[PDB]
Amino acid sequence: QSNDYRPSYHFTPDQYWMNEPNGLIKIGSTWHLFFQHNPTANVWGNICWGHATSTDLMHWAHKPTAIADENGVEAFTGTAYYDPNNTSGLGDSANPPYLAWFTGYTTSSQTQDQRLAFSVDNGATWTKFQGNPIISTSQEAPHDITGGLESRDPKVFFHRQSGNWIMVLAHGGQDKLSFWTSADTINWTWQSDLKSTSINGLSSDITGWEVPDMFELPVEGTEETTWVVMMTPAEGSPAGGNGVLAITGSFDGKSFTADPVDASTMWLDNGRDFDGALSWVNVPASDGRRIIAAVMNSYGSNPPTTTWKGMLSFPRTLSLKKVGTQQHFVQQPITELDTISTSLQILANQTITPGQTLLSSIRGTALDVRVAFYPDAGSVLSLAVRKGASEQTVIKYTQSDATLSVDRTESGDISYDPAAGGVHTAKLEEDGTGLVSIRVLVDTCSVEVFGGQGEAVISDLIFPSDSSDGLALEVTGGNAVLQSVDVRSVSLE
Ligand SMILES: OC[C@H]1O[C@](O)(CO)[C@@H](O)[C@@H]1O
Ligand SMILES: OC[C@H]1O[C@](O)(CO)[C@@H](O)[C@@H]1O
Ligand code: NA
Numbered sequence: 001q002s003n004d005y006r007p008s009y010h011f012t013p014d015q016y017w018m019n020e021p022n023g024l025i026k027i028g029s030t031w032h033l034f035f036q037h038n039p040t041a042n043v044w045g046n047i048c049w050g051h052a053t054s055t056d057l058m059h060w061a062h063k064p065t066a067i068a069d070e071n072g073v074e075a076f077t078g079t080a081y082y083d084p085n086n087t088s089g090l091g092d093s094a095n096p097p098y099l100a101w102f103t104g105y106t107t108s109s110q111t112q113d114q115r116l117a118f119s120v121d122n123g124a125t126w127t128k129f130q131g132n133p134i135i136s137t138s139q140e141a142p143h144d145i146t147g148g149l150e151s152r153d154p155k156v157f158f159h160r161q162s163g164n165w166i167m168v169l170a171h172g173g174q175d176k177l178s179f180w181t182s183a184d185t186i187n188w189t190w191q192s193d194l195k196s197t198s199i200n201g202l203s204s205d206i207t208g209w210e211v212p213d214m215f216e217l218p219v220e221g222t223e224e225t226t227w228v229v230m231m232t233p234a235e236g237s238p239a240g241g242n243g244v245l246a247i248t249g250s251f252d253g254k255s256f257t258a259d260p261v262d263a264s265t266m267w268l269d270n271g272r273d274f275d276g277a278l279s280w281v282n283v284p285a286s287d288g289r290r291i292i293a294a295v296m297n298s299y300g301s302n303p304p305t306t307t308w309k310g311m312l313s314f315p316r317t318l319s320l321k322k323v324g325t326q327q328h329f330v331q332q333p334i335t336e337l338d339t340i341s342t343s344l345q346i347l348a349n350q351t352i353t354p355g356q357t358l359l360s361s362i363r364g365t366a367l368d369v370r371v372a373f374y375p376d377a378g379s380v381l382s383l384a385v386r387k388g389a390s391e392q393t394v395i396k397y398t399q400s401d402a403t404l405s406v407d408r409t410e411s412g413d414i415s416y417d418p419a420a421g422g423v424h425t426a427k428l429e430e431d432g433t434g435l436v437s438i439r440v441l442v443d444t445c446s447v448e449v450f451g452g453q454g455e456a457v458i459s460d461l462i463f464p465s466d467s468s469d470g471l472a473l474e475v476t477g478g479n480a481v482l483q484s485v486d487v488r489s490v491s492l493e
Helices: 137-143 334-338
Strands: 016-025 029-038 046-052 061-067 075-082 097-106 111-118 150-157 164-170 176-182 189-195 209-218 224-231 246-253 255-258 275-278 291-296 316-323 326-333 343-354 368-375 379-385 395-398 403-407 424-427 438-445 446-451 456-461 470-474 480-488
Touching: 016 046, 016 097, 016 275, 016 291, 016 343, 029 061, 029 075, 046 075, 061 097, 075 111, 075 209, 075 480, 111 137, 137 189, 164 403, 176 209, 189 255, 209 275, 209 316, 224 255, 224 275, 255 343, 275 326, 291 456, 326 438, 326 446, 343 368, 343 470, 368 379, 368 470, 379 438, 395 438, 395 446, 403 446, 470 480
Parallel strands: 016 075, 075 150, 150 209
Antiparallel strands: 016 029, 029 046, 046 061, 075 097, 097 111, 150 164, 164 176, 176 189, 209 224, 224 246, 246 255, 275 291, 291 316, 316 326, 343 480, 368 438, 368 480, 379 395, 379 470, 395 403, 403 424, 438 446, 446 456
């Protein structure tokens, strides 16, 4: 579109198609990113693990395929982990191995089995374990009523309290995860299933369970932690379709016991385009952040981009914290973003009234714009981004029903898919000072909108013309006092 809508500060594959991230892991001062890669760049192409690395979660260096599809077996999604005691015996004492478990998909028969790869050069190159699969369709069949066509996406981590490796497997339309234990990463034993029917407050509409992750989260600050399982069900999300949700509970090394869930707080995004989220494991304690990323493309091959398809979301932290008196999952872009952005316009304590249009001089397609404001009762604040002649993507805050909305009815090209337009909403309240906060990462073909402390998030693809690079900040039905507005441009350099 002049430039194939390439994002200028989000990850996209150097060429061809990406789906969800895989094997997210920090090794030394390097963040590793793998992802489902389709180099054939049509719907029938074989999937492998693509690979990129960075020191800052932003400047990515593309690497060759890490786990190839081979011998009729495609390398479907999975996760990674460090084996410092060489419990796998795949490394040695001098360098314990880094490990990746992935689903092997036999294209012709459609079977799904679990496989292992290992790296002894700190994640540079990966070798498939000679004993693969480590979990055969035979082992899966007593737990998979398709007999091993629906067992995938292994999340694996070492459980200190119990001294075992833990594998969490998803089962698609059987609407459950299974928990398996191992001492050596290779020989697994089923322990339990976590089934939709067992989770109080989880709707029947939430089906097609994929992409589990599992970790402990500090539960606010309060010296206590909790176990989190995060997954991407194929149905049931706020914007409809696939979506990312998270559930707290306890874990004893064999089975997960979920807390009651609340539909109003379980989903990690209310837009269309944030799906297959994983977190970076092995993050040193001095950092201590839970950082997640997902693919933004809910439209398969439809996005009007040619040399690439699929983009990674901008990495964001995930935390549990009280907003009012409700505990929420809360997300914010990583603070590293502040190192690559520059203010183009800053407002402090500025009153906006119906009829004015602020931010009219700004031109950019890569922006990170904060607004914090005290709206009048019954006022509607609107921030139009990627604005041109007949194009705009409008973020509104409606005070009267406390709703953050993202409206793509006029974004640009919304003809590529029936779900490309419309309006997405999320609940967002004033804080106790009356202050509403909103932050929008704008890039060539996306918006990621955070409300409040990050209790509300809407991530969506958009395809405006390149010349649609204005902003317009307006208010109707009332005034607002803009405590701050910081419009920053973003550049990788
Ligand atoms: O396993 C790779 C992931 O992509 C999917 O096709 C989701 O549609 C499944 O394969 C899995 O969730
Ligand atoms: O949307 C489906 C996604 O998966 C791919 O086949 C790559 O693995 C791409 O077409 C696309 O971005
Ligand atoms: Na989605």
